[PDB]
């Protein structure tokens, strides 16, 4: 169920769009490594990870990763490692980048 709506998390931006996520992440109060989780604009329980990066060729750049939900419960960005919830996934990728453009550092500022 959802239920899984843990909007108690500082990094969860439920009803924000892709573009607004990019705009909020690129704001001056945030830096490279900033991130958020957002729900799909159409599909409930479908989520994305949005991450602020810095590329030597472009400026600040925002990268998006689709999060997949398995029907039995659980989440993954890479099928190499699944998590029992989004919050464990965040902690994992805060610990090591493990395929992402960089380690997750701070939640995007409200």
Please give the resolution of this entry in Å, rounded to 1 decimal. 2.1
Query: What single DSSP character describes residue 18?
Result: H
Nearest to 73 by CA among 2, 7, 21, 8: 2
Cβ contact 39:46 at 8 Å: yes
Using only C-alpha atoms, the chain has a radius of gyration, in whole angstroms, of 13
Distance in angstroms (rounded) separating the CA atoms of residues 36 and 51? 7
Distance in angstroms (rounded) separating the CA atoms of residues 37 and 50? 6
Tally of structural domains, the chain: 1
Beta-carbon contacts of residue 4 (< 8 Å; ≥ 6 apart): 45, 85, 86
Distance in angstroms (rounded) separating the CA atoms of residues 32 and 2? 31
**Method for structure elucidation:** X-ray
- DSSP 3-state of 92: helix
- Rounded alpha-carbon distances, angstroms, from residue 43 to 10, 65, 70: 22, 16, 14
Distance in angstroms (rounded) separating the CA atoms of residues 21 and 49? 10
Beta-carbon contacts of residue 14 (< 8 Å; ≥ 6 apart): 5, 7, 38, 39
Q: Where are the alpha helices (DSSP H) in 1-110?
A: 18-25, 86-95
Looking at residue 12, which CATH number applies to its domain? 3.30.505.10
Domain that holds residue 1: 1-110
Beta-carbon contacts of residue 32 (< 8 Å; ≥ 6 apart): 52, 53, 54, 60, 102, 105
């Amino acid at each position: 169920a959802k239920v899984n709506t843990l909007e108690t998390e500082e990094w969860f931006f439920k009803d924000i769009t892709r573009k607004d996520a990019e705009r909020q992440l690129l704001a001056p109060g945030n830096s490279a490594g900033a991130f958020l989780i957002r729900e799909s604009e159409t599909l409930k329980g479908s989520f994305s990870l949005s991450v602020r990066d810095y590329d030597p060729m472009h400026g600040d750049v925002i990268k998006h990763y689709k999060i997949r939900s398995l029907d039995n419960g659980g989440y993954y960005i890479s099928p190499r490692i699944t998590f029992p919830c989004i919050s464990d996934m965040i902690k994992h990728y805060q610990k090591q980048s493990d395929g992402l453009c960089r380690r997750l550092e701070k939640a995007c500022i409200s």
